[PDB]
């Protein structure tokens, strides 16, 4: 199918407790493959997937250098943002950045991304054209002017259309055993009476990869969107994900309810009932 590569970065200041903590992780689809933590013993970018371990020491040296340089620029950027928002040096603040690319089944670029948030809020984002910016407020407009004058967007476009796609394609090949295998969900329905008059039906999906999935309950064929309790898809810790959806049903009406499961690993959507 389609695939994505993403690098995530978070710097969190801590006045009076040293310099900001910087953590960055890289993902292909829902698979973590590299990490870096500024508070680690001897910080270096570390592998987290077997198919990246074959990259040579030159690759790890350059990656670690980039990570350390990003930690430093984040520290400078956090100081700048205090000025832009007329804020005190007393408080903890957060700078987040994500960048990456999406490619289709053919390996063609579908789109690229580069975006930032300050204190959990949109700050500035590269537009899908990879040539213009969306600034969230008048502070980000200052960054926009600076990045326009420095032709940052042109540099990002070159990366996102070139190395981003090329190295994602490389990683997909080297890790094809896992990155190009979809594990379908194992599914079942559980029943828990609440009362003499009502019962909970819970539709379970376990052990699936990638994380994207749709679980829906129908009553007499009608989606129960409004009355369905849907928990966030969650990691099992073995690369796979879990999710459930629950409805409250009148006692005796259980057979009118059907759970429908859609997942890339399934050739056809599944329909399940309480047995």
């Amino acid at each position: 199918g389609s695939h994505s590569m993403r690098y995530f970065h978070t710097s969190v200041s801590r006045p009076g407790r040293g310099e900001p903590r910087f953590i960055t992780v890289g993902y292909v689809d829902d698979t973590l493959f590299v990490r870096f933590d500024s508070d680690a013993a001897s910080p270096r970018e570390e592998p987290r997937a077997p198919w990246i371990e074959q990259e040579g020491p030159e690759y790890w040296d350059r990656e670690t250098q980039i990570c350390k340089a990003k930690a430093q620029t984040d520290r400078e950027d956090l100081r700048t943002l205090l000025r832009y928002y007329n804020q005190s040096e007393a408080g903890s603040h957060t700078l987040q950045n994500m960048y990456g690319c999406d490619v289709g089944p053919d390996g063609r670029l579908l789109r690229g991304y580069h975006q930032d948030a300050y204190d959990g809020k949109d700050y500035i984002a590269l537009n899908e054209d990879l040539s213009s910016w969306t600034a969230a407020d008048t502070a980000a407009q200052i960054t926009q002017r600076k990045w326009e004058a420095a032709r940052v967007a042109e540099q990002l476009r070159a990366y996102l259309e070139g190395e981003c796609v090329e190295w994602l394609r490389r990683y997909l090949e080297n890790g094809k055993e896992t990155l190009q295998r979809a594990d379908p969900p194992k599914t079942h329905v559980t029943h828990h009476p609440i009362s003499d008059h009502e019962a909970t039906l819970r539709c379970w999906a376990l052990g699936f990869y990638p994380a994207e999935i749709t679980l829906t309950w129908q009553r007499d064929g009608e989606d129960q969107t409004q009355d369905t309790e849907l928990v966030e898809t969650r990691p099992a810790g073995d690369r796979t994900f879990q999710k459930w959806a629950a409805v409250v049903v009148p006692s005796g009406e259980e057979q009118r309810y059907t759970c429908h499961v859609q997942h890339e690993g399934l050739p056809k959507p599944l329909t399940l009932r309480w047995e």
């Binding site: 890289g26 990656e63 980039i66 960048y99 540099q155 190395e163 981003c164």
Partner: peptide, 6 residues
Amino acid sequence: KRWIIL
């Protein structure tokens, strides 16, 4: 492979 803000 990462990009570096030049």
